[PDB]
Structure 1
Amino acid sequence: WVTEACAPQCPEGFDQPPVILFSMDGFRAEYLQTWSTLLPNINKLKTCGLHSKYMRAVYPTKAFPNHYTIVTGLYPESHGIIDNNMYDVYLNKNFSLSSVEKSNPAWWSGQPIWLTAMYQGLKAASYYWPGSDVAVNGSFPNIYRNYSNSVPYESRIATLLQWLDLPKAERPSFYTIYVEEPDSAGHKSGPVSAGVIKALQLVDDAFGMLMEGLKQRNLHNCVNIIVLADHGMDQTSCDRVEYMTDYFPEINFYMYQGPAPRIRTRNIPQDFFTFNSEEIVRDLSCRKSDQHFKPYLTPDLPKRLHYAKNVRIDKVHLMVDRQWLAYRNKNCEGGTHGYNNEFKSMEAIFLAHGPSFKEKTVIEPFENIEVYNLLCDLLHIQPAPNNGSHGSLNHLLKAPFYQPSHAEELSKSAGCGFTTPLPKDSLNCSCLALQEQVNQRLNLNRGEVSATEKTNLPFGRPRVIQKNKDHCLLYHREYVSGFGKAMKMPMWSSYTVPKPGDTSSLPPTVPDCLRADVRVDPSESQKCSFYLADQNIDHGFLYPPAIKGNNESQYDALITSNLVPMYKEFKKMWDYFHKVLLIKYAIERNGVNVVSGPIFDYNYDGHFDAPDEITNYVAGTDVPVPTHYFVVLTSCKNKTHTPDSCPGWLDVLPFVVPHRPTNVESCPENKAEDLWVEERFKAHIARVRDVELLTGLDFYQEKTQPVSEILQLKTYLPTF
């Protein structure tokens, strides 16, 4: 097989192609990029089959949360396996590999692919995989193996080939195989060592034995095989360890040490909830100038991680920097994983071979949450509810099983039509600069509406995937917004900033000028007096008035309908972004389409809040306070075209920045805004899908491109 050239070549009795999910623990993406030519079997798989540049793992980049994510399509917060070592307050039990609690089904939520196949007629076998030797939902796979780490790779392969030799009625359709290397070698001497080369060659021989075994049964061009990894590997040092003794006089708390630390009380279950979590994060925030960790309360963590909605996830969390560790007191010489999933070293491998997959294809990076839906498509079965966007992985398949469709709008735009240029209620807003006939600019004719629809909405208006959401669209010459009547603020604001000429002299925002929007009813509008009573929250502009047109154009944005509740400290970041950063991004991208708006996620479940879920409002008013603010930047991949006139692929840069009363996360004491604002926005980069879930809005529905291709853009995570 290894010396043979590149190839629906299924033998007698094989109607549907069998699926084999192969896991090579700790096989980082860099290992394939650098050492593929030293591994002849994996190199042939890389040459002949399909492979991604890398596969993104889930946070924390550990074995058990990641392996169970691959088979469920769920984030650790949903499937329950948040770590290998965890504690549940309600169960009052400790989960560990050395305990009998590993086999307890109470810890394992969701529906793994073996159960999904079993519940839909198909049979499933497993030769090691976390959860496979556990009775998840009261059921084990048809054939399984109780974990034993030292069983030779040849024996694991031989048993799998023996399972494929079984008669059609007994023979499983889905298979899982797991190997401990090159992870074990990665821990011992780091990712750049002779030990990892020996381990990479060992796993190549294992894969080679499987391919040669399949060739002997004439299944080498029949079986749909996926070769992947749970996470990557990075080098550690004992000179690169942060100690909690340097921040606390005495440690009275329990700490899950390493690259992804969690802090809780020692007195469990009695003090689990009463434990001052907010005190520990405050006691660790901005303590040292060159601090190699950042403390966080789980809802404050970047939204793209989706690591908060689970009782097993302790409120105190530490984000450790690259190649660093965080320990309780004074191993570390070698290598480890568990760090941020965006880190290059934490990136895993993904290779695919078989009749259903495209030949000699290099695909762009994707996330492990998407693998579950693909496994269902290969097995011709219906997936259980998961976090993967069904259809985003169709570009990997020759003939896609599932055809995705646009999300249907549950609420249509109504009202807010122009009637009279004079407002019925001033709403305690004042603009002494006027005299008021600038209100006629808001009265756009059919041609004027069509003109702003083409420029500011090139991919169409974001659809409202919310039932009974009373809203209206507001048209202006420089921007278009979707105003939410119940919350008295816009859900979204779309505008295409053209390529700027000179950075030297840019016009500022017109001060002390604010008026009522004549189109919006006073009862559904915000008042300027609402912000006088509140001392921590001030009014902010969603669309920046001075970004487009002249001084006359600014008046179209100096209205109550463009107002959003903002913390004085957050307003500093927001204003710096729209004044400096956004213009810089517009130069590089040859114009940029901006879609901004508020996010409400008080229960931190990653979904848009229901009115009853909002716990904070503007002092003595029903105007809700947003938890986060989204900024989705869309430009053309080909920089020769502007976002409003682009026929090809799009380039996206979404942000989900937390709306916090302090900027303690940035540690900005005596630091100018050019040193921390960009760093803070970049730290909160998310996918378009993340924004969609948090808002209940669906983007790019009017973009002339297949749904499967738009889903690739919606699941894309920009990396710098």
Structure 2
Amino acid sequence: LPPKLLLVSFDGFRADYLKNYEFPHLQNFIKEGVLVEHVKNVFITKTFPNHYSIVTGLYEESHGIVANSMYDAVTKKHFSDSNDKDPFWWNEAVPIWVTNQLQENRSSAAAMWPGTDVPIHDTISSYFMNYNSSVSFEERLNNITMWLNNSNPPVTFATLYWEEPDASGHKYGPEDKENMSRVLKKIDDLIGDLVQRLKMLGLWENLNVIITSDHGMTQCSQDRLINLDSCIDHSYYTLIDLSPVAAILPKINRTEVYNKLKNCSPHMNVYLKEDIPNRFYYQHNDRIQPIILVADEGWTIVLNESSQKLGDHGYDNSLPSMHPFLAAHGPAFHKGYKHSTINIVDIYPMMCHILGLKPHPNNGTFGHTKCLLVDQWCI
């Protein structure tokens, strides 16, 4: 019987939510398993780029999903979260569900995880759901766990995705404790539903489960706005992505666009593509535009009519507010161990190890995850 792994993401689960709200079900999951208190994720700290990093072990410049909205000038193709089904956009890397699927006598399964409804290098998971945000968590849970438990050839890798607490974190902002506590209580209940379901099917003792997320959330404010329309005319550039990392494609002399934008607000950094800080690993890809604007934490780049959004993410990946957490339980994981931090790109080599897959070249460090694993030396 080959090892099995369920990877679960609750979108937008800021690491310090664990310290500020009560998660009885998640804490029960943790006490018989492992917790990484905060994971250093990848810039830019958006949903599609970070989910792909988890399943590839790659920085965004390397796997090619550099934002939730992209434009490739050469092919003229556009990407958005809904318009995300052209394999072109995913083919710069090979995600773990593909490597798993290519093994004889093994299958992959998916319930709503970004990209899992797209054939990547001509490979699609045996079981997958076409993205549909209306599908309940119960349906996602029941189908994913039934697939893991039944199925032949056996399902050895599975993904499970949920849109909260990201959606409501944007709505209320993470500083709204009254409303966020209700949001997060529901997430904790869903975690309880996951555990109860695993136990009922007798998967709980033998399935490896990772519960994690893609990024956190920080508070935005009408006192912290940078209006591009106040700084530069529309006719000078095309806006590929807006806030808090604006992707700017100049229509005229780049130097002219740069000179206006660099004198717009002290609350953002304005970079020529070739000046983007090395620490971001966000330069070496044609999908990165000639100029990017990076707003300081809690600042929002707007146009004249841009809607209010009390919470946001996308900021510098060194900010604690942007970091998710990771927890895990199962035969491969220690019981009751807690660790400060790992990098989000380390999850991939760890998962390949648990599953006995050959990892593709990546940016992760397996060593960072050894203390989580029963078969490994913990220095």
Which bin holds the TM-score, normalised by the shorter protein?
over 0.9
**1:106 corresponding residue in structure 2:** 88
Q: Which has the larger radius of gyration?
A: 1
User: What is the CA deviation profile of residues 486-540 of structure 1, one whole-angstrom value per residue up to 9, with x for unaligned ones?
Assistant: xxxxxxxxxxxxxxxxxxxxxxxxxxxxxxxxxxxxxxxxxxxxxxxxxxxxxxx
Match of 1:200, SS state, is: helix
CA distance in structure 2 between the partners assigned to 1:170 and 1:195 by the alignment:
44
Residue 211 of structure 1 and its aligned partner are, at CA, apart by 1.1
**2:247 corresponding residue in structure 1:** 262
**1:175 corresponding residue in structure 2:** 158
**135, 138, 150: which one aligns with 2:134:** 150
**162, 178, 188: which one aligns with 2:146:** 162
**282, 292, 299: which one aligns with 2:267:** 292
CA distance in structure 2 between the partners assigned to 1:281 and 1:33 by the alignment:
42
CA distance in structure 1 between the partners assigned to 2:96 and 2:352 by the alignment:
7
**171, 196, 199: which one aligns with 2:183:** 199
CA distance in structure 2 between the partners assigned to 1:230 and 1:32 by the alignment:
15
**1:382 corresponding residue in structure 2:** 358
CA distance in structure 1 between the partners assigned to 2:137 and 2:264 by the alignment:
49
**1:315 corresponding residue in structure 2:** 290
Assess, with a 3 A threshold, how the Cα gap between structure 1 residues 284 and 378 changes in structure 2: closer, same or farther.
same
Assess, with a 3 A threshold, how the Cα gap between structure 1 residues 251 and 343 changes in structure 2: closer, same or farther.
farther
Query: What's the TM-score, normalizing by structure 1?
Result: 0.50
Q: Contact 2:41 / 2:214 at 8 angstroms: preserved in 1?
A: yes
Residue 333 of structure 1 and its aligned partner are, at CA, apart by 4.2
Q: Contact 1:293 / 1:319 at 8 angstroms: preserved in 2?
A: yes
Assess, with a 3 A threshold, how the Cα gap between structure 1 residues 247 and 224 changes in structure 2: closer, same or farther.
same
**2:324 corresponding residue in structure 1:** 348
Match of 2:62, SS state, is: helix
Q: Percent identity?
A: 36
Match of 1:351, SS state, is: strand
Q: Contact 1:82 / 1:312 at 8 angstroms: preserved in 2?
A: yes
Query: What's the TM-score, normalizing by structure 2?
Result: 0.94
**2:124 corresponding residue in structure 1:** 140
Assess, with a 3 A threshold, how the Cα gap between structure 1 residues 165 and 320 changes in structure 2: closer, same or farther.
same
CA distance in structure 1 between the partners assigned to 2:164 and 2:337 by the alignment:
26
Q: Give the partner amino acid of 2:253.
A: N
Match of 1:365, SS state, is: strand
CA distance in structure 1 between the partners assigned to 2:148 and 2:82 by the alignment:
32
CA distance in structure 1 between the partners assigned to 2:262 and 2:157 by the alignment:
48
Residue 217 of structure 1 and its aligned partner are, at CA, apart by 2.4
Q: Give the partner amino acid of 1:155.
A: E
**2:258 corresponding residue in structure 1:** 281
Residue 140 of structure 1 and its aligned partner are, at CA, apart by 0.7
Q: CA RMSD in A?
A: 1.8
**2:314 corresponding residue in structure 1:** 338
CA distance in structure 1 between the partners assigned to 2:3 and 2:10 by the alignment:
22
CA distance in structure 1 between the partners assigned to 2:270 and 2:196 by the alignment:
50
Assess, with a 3 A threshold, how the Cα gap between structure 1 residues 312 and 250 changes in structure 2: closer, same or farther.
closer
**1:372 corresponding residue in structure 2:** 348
**2:4 corresponding residue in structure 1:** 18
CA distance in structure 2 between the partners assigned to 1:278 and 1:366 by the alignment:
39
**336, 339, 343: which one aligns with 1:360:** 336
**1:219 corresponding residue in structure 2:** 203
Match of 1:392, SS state, is: helix
Q: Contact 2:149 / 2:203 at 8 angstroms: preserved in 1?
A: no
Residue 79 of structure 1 and its aligned partner are, at CA, apart by 1.3
What does 1:558-577 align with in structure 2 at a 5 Å threshold?
none
Residue 281 of structure 1 and its aligned partner are, at CA, apart by 2.8
What does 1:28-177 align with in structure 2 at a 5 Å threshold?
28-35=14-21, 38-99=22-83, 102-108=84-90, 109-121=92-104, 122-167=106-151, 169-177=152-160
User: What is the CA deviation profile of residues 462-496 of structure 1, one whole-angstrom value per residue up to 9, with x for unaligned ones?
Assistant: xxxxxxxxxxxxxxxxxxxxxxxxxxxxxxxxxxx
CA distance in structure 1 between the partners assigned to 2:60 and 2:255 by the alignment:
23
Assess, with a 3 A threshold, how the Cα gap between structure 1 residues 164 and 287 changes in structure 2: closer, same or farther.
closer
Residue 47 of structure 1 and its aligned partner are, at CA, apart by 2.6
Residue 282 of structure 1 and its aligned partner are, at CA, apart by 3.1
Assess, with a 3 A threshold, how the Cα gap between structure 1 residues 48 and 390 changes in structure 2: closer, same or farther.
closer
Q: Give the partner amino acid of 1:23.
A: S
Assess, with a 3 A threshold, how the Cα gap between structure 1 residues 287 and 97 changes in structure 2: closer, same or farther.
closer
* 1:238 matched to 2:215: no
**1:184 corresponding residue in structure 2:** 167
Residue 52 of structure 1 and its aligned partner are, at CA, apart by 1.2
CA distance in structure 2 between the partners assigned to 1:113 and 1:374 by the alignment:
11
Unaligned runs of 5+ in 1: 1-14, 267-274, 401-705, 710-720
Assess, with a 3 A threshold, how the Cα gap between structure 1 residues 91 and 241 changes in structure 2: closer, same or farther.
same
CA distance in structure 2 between the partners assigned to 1:33 and 1:277 by the alignment:
45
Residue 74 of structure 1 and its aligned partner are, at CA, apart by 1.1
What does 1:320-719 align with in structure 2 at a 5 Å threshold?
320-329=295-304, 331-400=307-376
In terms of fraction of residues, the more helix-rich structure is: 2
**1:568 corresponding residue in structure 2:** none
CA distance in structure 2 between the partners assigned to 1:329 and 1:210 by the alignment:
44
Q: Give the partner amino acid of 1:18.
A: K
Match of 1:114, SS state, is: helix
User: What is the CA deviation profile of residues 13-47 of structure 1, one whole-angstrom value per residue up to 9, with x for unaligned ones?
Assistant: xx233100000000000111211xx2211111233
Q: Contact 2:66 / 2:287 at 8 angstroms: preserved in 1?
A: yes
CA distance in structure 1 between the partners assigned to 2:197 and 2:170 by the alignment:
31
Residue 147 of structure 1 and its aligned partner are, at CA, apart by 0.6
Q: Contact 2:87 / 2:121 at 8 angstroms: preserved in 1?
A: yes
Following TM superposition, the consecutive aligned residue runs of length 4 or more in structure 1 with deviations greater than 4 angstroms are none
Residue 195 of structure 1 and its aligned partner are, at CA, apart by 2.9
CA distance in structure 1 between the partners assigned to 2:48 and 2:264 by the alignment:
33
Assess, with a 3 A threshold, how the Cα gap between structure 1 residues 374 and 93 changes in structure 2: closer, same or farther.
same
Assess, with a 3 A threshold, how the Cα gap between structure 1 residues 98 and 132 changes in structure 2: closer, same or farther.
closer
Residue 210 of structure 1 and its aligned partner are, at CA, apart by 1.7
CA distance in structure 2 between the partners assigned to 1:389 and 1:165 by the alignment:
31
Assess, with a 3 A threshold, how the Cα gap between structure 1 residues 286 and 49 changes in structure 2: closer, same or farther.
same
Residue 249 of structure 1 and its aligned partner are, at CA, apart by 5.5
Unaligned runs of 5+ in 2: none
Q: Contact 1:222 / 1:354 at 8 angstroms: preserved in 2?
A: yes
Q: Give the partner amino acid of 1:261.
A: A
Assess, with a 3 A threshold, how the Cα gap between structure 1 residues 287 and 241 changes in structure 2: closer, same or farther.
closer
Residue 98 of structure 1 and its aligned partner are, at CA, apart by 3.6
Q: Give the partner amino acid of 1:75.
A: Y
- Structure possessing the higher relative contact order (Cα contacts under 8 Å, 6 or more residues apart): 2
CA distance in structure 2 between the partners assigned to 1:354 and 1:276 by the alignment:
57
Residue 293 of structure 1 and its aligned partner are, at CA, apart by 0.7
